[PDB]
Symmetry: D2
Subunit: 476 residues, 4 copies
């Protein structure tokens, strides 16, 4: 393996900056490469190119824009192993899961291309509202918003770059992608696929750099017409106060509850809970982060979950381990603190805590109470609390007391009751007898409270990054 010096895509050209940021693999410390450390003047060059490209891009037919997206997705499928191998090292994601992330990104790009090209407008009748305006009709068609700034997260630096880029591009918007620093190589590899597909100069560009130099600058810039961001809740809250009146989409944290009723299939509930809670070592916003279980089935459910947590593989990304090293030392320190607080307050550790560097073994706690930090705080690590409840009303109350409202799971055999519970839960999506998940990517993805703003899922993302233009006239 030889570390490479990567370049940003700026107005159809690949550009270095005077300074750069060296990226290391979180699992091994191996140097992977460097990405440019852009200056504010270089961000200005990116946005000037994007605004100059907008007129010719938005005036192309939908089929012409869709052709570029399909070509980019075919190139990603062609290079999925080459890109997935680097994505795996960059964010300590299992090799197979990293290659699957690249394939999922090609699927979302293809799906957005076809969803976006068949968007329709509407014709409204004046006579629906008043008799005197019966000959007046409004011809309402969709239009792009302009320049979209897409900011991807470290945990899905390609998938949640494509989930923003393709819906924005099909609608006729121009895009600047700002990947996270830990994930910027993978983001620039995605950019190479769009460049090789022949995306016109300035239509798609990348920005890489340090938060202290360009962090607020890329968002506050008046060239930006829309900010689409996935990342931490505190950073998300900052973007909301910098966007001003400009539309935004935020995908932030979660503390998804899994409510287990007395009539649940406990073995199946345990399977779905462990798959959801410990995927990518719990470093997912949509992940079962707390089990709210009825007292009478709690001992048997905990035994079923424990059996499965003990069998999860813990190790290196190259080995496709279920639990891989966390993204950085600060993240593992934070998770260890939550583990220590639950232990010191009397929670039962059903599986042992171990920390090898930043590789934390999966910890399952029973008898977790609302005074413990782990009942509320999003860990972004492999630790799952089980909180016992006496009534369904109590589970709803504890679930809704969270500042997060991304998704919830309900495990029961009474679906009419599960729907009644789902109506009361302050979340975007409720999965019945299955783990929480963003997929399938055509379904809406949204969070209530501090989990975000806006509705994603492919068609919803296109609708968010478009506006309408109405032309009104009188028939004679």
């Amino acid at each position: 393996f030889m570390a490479k010096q990567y370049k940003n895509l700026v107005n159809g050209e690949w550009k270095l900056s005077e300074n750069e940021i060296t990226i290391y693999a979180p699992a091994t410390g191996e140097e992977l490469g460097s990405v440019p450390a852009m200056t504010q003047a270089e961000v200005d060059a990116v946005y000037a190119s994007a605004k100059k490209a907008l007129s010719d891009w938005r005036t192309l037919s939908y089929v012409e824009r869709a052709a570029y997206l399909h070509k980019a997705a075919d190139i990603l499928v062609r290079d999925a192993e080459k890109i997935g191998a680097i994505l795996s090292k960059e964010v300590a994601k299992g090799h197979k899961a990293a290659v699957s992330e690249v394939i999922r990104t090609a699927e979302i790009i293809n799906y957005a291309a076809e969803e976006g090209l068949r968007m329709e407008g509407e014709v409204l009748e004046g006579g629906s509202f008043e008799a005197a305006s019966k000959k007046k009709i409004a011809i309402v068609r969709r239009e792009p918003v302009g320049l979209v700034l897409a900011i991807s997260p470290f945990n899905y630096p390609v998938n949640l770059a494509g989930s923003k880029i393709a819906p924005a591009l099909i609608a006729g918007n121009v895009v600047a992608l700002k990947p996270p620093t830990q994930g910027s190589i993978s983001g620039l590899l995605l950019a190479e696929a769009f460049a090789e597909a022949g995306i016109p100069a300035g239509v798609f560009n990348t920005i890489t750099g340090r938060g202290s130099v360009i962090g607020d600058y890329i968002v506050e810039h008046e060239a930006v017409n829309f900010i689409n961001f996935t990342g931490s809740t505190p950073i998300g809250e900052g973007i909301g106060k910098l966007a001003g009146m400009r539309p935004i989409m935020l995908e932030l944290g979660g503390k998804d509850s899994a409510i287990v009723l007395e009539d649940a299939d406990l073995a199946l509930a345990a399977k779905n809970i462990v798959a959801g809670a410990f995927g990518y070592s719990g470093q997912r916003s949509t992940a079962v982060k707390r089990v709210l279980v009825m007292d009478k089935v709690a001992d048997q459910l905990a035994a079923e979950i424990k059996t499965l947590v003990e069998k999860l593989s813990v190790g290196m990304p190259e080995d496709d381990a279920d639990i891989t090293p966390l993204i950085d030392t600060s993240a593992a320190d934070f998770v260890e603190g939550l583990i220590k607080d639950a232990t010191d307050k009397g929670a039962t550790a059903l599986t042992a805590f171990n920390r090898e560097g930043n590789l934390i073994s999966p910890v399952l706690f029973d008898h977790v109470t609302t005074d413990m930090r782990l009942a509320w705080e999003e860990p972004f690590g492999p630790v799952l609390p089980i909180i016992r409840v006496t009534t369904v009303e109590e589970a709803i109350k504890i679930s809704n007391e969270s500042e997060y409202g991304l998704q919830a799971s309900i495990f029961t055999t009474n679906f009419p009751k599960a729907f009644g519970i789902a109506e009361q839960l302050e979340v975007g999506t409720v999965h019945l007898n299955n783990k929480t998940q963003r997929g399938t990517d055509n379904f809406p993805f949204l969070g209530a409270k501090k989990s975000g703003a806006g509705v994603q899922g492919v068609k919803y993302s296109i609708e968010a990054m478009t506006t309408v233009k109405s032309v009104v006239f009188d028939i004679q």
Copy 2:
């Protein structure tokens, strides 16, 4: 007893001959309705086609206003109309008033659904780059003249459910109620006339089937036929309509599939309410219970108990089981009951008939060689057919030529949804009786149960077409 008249071009008209209508439960003379000739039908259709141009060019809000006024009049006169409706079709007095109230609800809902219908704007650039400046402006238009044919069992509700969706969209209408039910249809017509519906926009036709039955459907003036009635009549209409669009609500033999894990008391409650409502003279009634062997004995006893509590008597006393529409209908039902007894079915409640008042009959051990397992009785008789597997319940359910609705009683909803996908029916109700309601929901039948989708927005969509205006932006 009154001599009723047809609404034709804003005028009330008698014909040379009349048909006297008697109450099926008492034989009380209620009045007479005109026996229209083919020439008088021609004048109804000429009047409607003449009124169509001004009617379709009104705004949606203007058409909605006439419907809201007609619905307000039906609410005002619900007791007065319901009292006559009750007698004309031997429906319980309170149920007849409820029917008029429900009709007013449907009319008001159709008026507001229809006035906000929107068109679409399509892009040529979605299909080919060279046509990126070509757009299509697609707006809805009425089909023209709608012939609405209502049934005896819901002569006001299933007249208004066709009339109001047709009218809001700009169509003109001719209502042909059944002879037994024609007074009720003409009473509904009075509310539209009092509401100020323009002359010729809404009209009525009454007469004998041997004189005008085929004539009204085959007439070139009619652009759409919307009918509710028996399957043999519907089949004839489908042939006579030719290429013209149709809505048909025909026979039903709705199955209620009861699984081993069902709440049997809840299943029995819904099955008896669904099977015996209006003495079983409903297309959406539960007409056969397909029950898994292990719970069949318990379910049969629970159903029997509730059948024994049904009141049997006169419409004026709000009996659950009233006399059937006519002698021919009760002879047919008696014949199906005799066939089942002769073939060995167990009568849990046995056959009793006084005039055309048949007591509710419940049969167990009904087999596929019995007429009652398949034929729609339109009477108060319910067969219970035992099955060994869910696959057998699906197969027997789907072997019917009918497929209006089905019910599934079980605590496993993902499994119930999987069964619902396999059933050749329009709607599947989980842990409830089969029913048309609520009236905003789609209502349709597969195979010989009909054509087209009803329910308010669906009926509006059915009785409209589109007009596309295409041009190139410069």
Copy 3:
């Protein structure tokens, strides 16, 4: 000399007897297609109904992958298929290859449109407060077996435009191409077979109308009939379908209304391209010019100049005007020309006929007592009818039994839209010739021009039904 075979249940089969097919322009023997019996049609339908369960239970993604593969094969073989299609229906070589490429585009578009199939969730509380916890989950389902009947004039495009929308939605299909056009239909079928379409999901039928014509439509296995052809055959199909859903694209007599303020050069260009494309053998062709008298002499002169430049000759030479499909078609067009001449119409270009190759005929001073003012010729003849007012143009346009499309040539768009509202047609094109495209736009007729709405999403909607599952939230 090749003996073509039908695709039946995944295998290619001949029949005992065969129909030899000849190139209409040269008499060249192209090969033979099977002469299926009624029993062979039964076997095709049984194989399709058997395949339906496993096909409808596939995911939309899986059904779309087959359609995309079939479309790629059609693109790969466009020259090979186009070459035979050109000979079989005497269509210009380049235009025949273009038909194949357009079919692949429609198939790809249908696969992507149908895979995004959405349902609806309706609220009981929208209609009545007591049912606020009742919801309806409404999902789309295939109708079952679709019989697609393609026309000779678009034997691949109007086979693929029916087949792909039906297949993506989970329907199984039987394609019956016209006898003159069956080799092209079976060549299209090869692409679906090589794509690996499961056995029985897609099948073909070929045979004589006297043996299987009515039989294929009356058969109770068929759940939907999607046909393109002439009005008299379509009228027969509506009756034989009974209550089953249909899509019919029949005759057209599209008017081109030219007002005093029209851009006459643009009107002439569009009128000539639309009227004489494929020798006028198109349902959507401009078939009558209704022009305001003050601009008629100049409009007729500019049309005449462009008509005289059309090439007249053989399909292999990409001539604009090629020989008509058969002798009967050319005799029918000749009779219309003679009637117009005998009634005083002015021949701006002269009639000539060599075999079934009729030179393009333009008539002026055509009146409403001439057959050519009303009857669909399906040949290279265009009448110009002078009018004194826009009201007269609308009246004459609407007096036609046909109503597929119309064109309006004027610089006053708001007035053109007001005229479009009054025309009894499916689509009105402003300042352009009538056309079906783009294939995402709706395509439909009024009066005797058809039944149902075509255009990709509309065709998918027509060949699906809904299944509503209703339950109460607790």
Copy 4:
């Protein structure tokens, strides 16, 4: 006639310790007072609203619609009573003020019926991946929660009801904050909702001084959505305080009327004058600059000039076309734009006159884009005519504005007019008609600094709802 008005808070009418006296801008007449709420009183309004939300969101749509219909019937009944006071409060013509109340009732009724039949969707997992073919998503609408509606002085009843009714039908609870000049009208609208029997806490009002509760009402954690109409500077401040919460902003405009050589100049002049000078130009949606092709400019300017010379200038009680502006600062700002245009050499076709805050209508010709009047929203009766020689120049000048609410195009070539409309950076283009918000079922939106979000009845309902997805696997 001056009354002590009260806020509607949790079904009761409350005064505060301090009050704000409201005077008629045209005459100085004392109209009454409105409470000067404290931050703790705002907290009580929001606590009441969140408490009422649970039982309101779980009602059926038909039950919520019945309250809106009853409230609209009450507004029609009291249209003269409310309009008489609204006219004095914001110096709007008496008949125009009554018409505003009637229009509000129309919007409320249309919102009740539009909202009650909104639907959910069912999505197939098999549309995206074969392995999830038995997974389906049942997606239903849900309210966003508590909506803070902030109405503007120029439409204090119409653009209060335009936010309240769409929010309520969807199951949201509402707090209306009228502008201080327009708070009596806002509280009169609240009386109709209260008499209609709207449950306690479902609909509430807030009145007070900007220096006591201005930022507080927006920054409050209880508020889940802010729906505002008003000035661009205030709207931009709301964007800073909303954080992650969804907003709708209806801000300023500088609508262009593009007049081509083939236009019907009499039709263009009539529409331009009706739109520009309605309510003395104090409307965001109003023709605020004429971009005319030079060949027809002398004729168009003469036709506009004759119509402007006929507009009545006077008091709201006399239904004058031009009434006194809302306040002295507003009139001073308008006079400044007029003076800049005069000093830079524009031709004053109609004479400038100012008596108190009543400015006579001023029409300028030969306005060049170095003049402030070419760009700045006056909110007063002044209109510039800017001559251009090409359509491309008219499009460039039109789009150079920071505003993008609406535009008008006057021409007989509609295919060309549609091609121009595609290039204009606005929410709506009206062909051969003045810009206007109506009909209220149509979308109403502005690009650039004119706003955020899409209004019009169905659009406002969609904006103030979210979705709840329930995903399960068929077996």
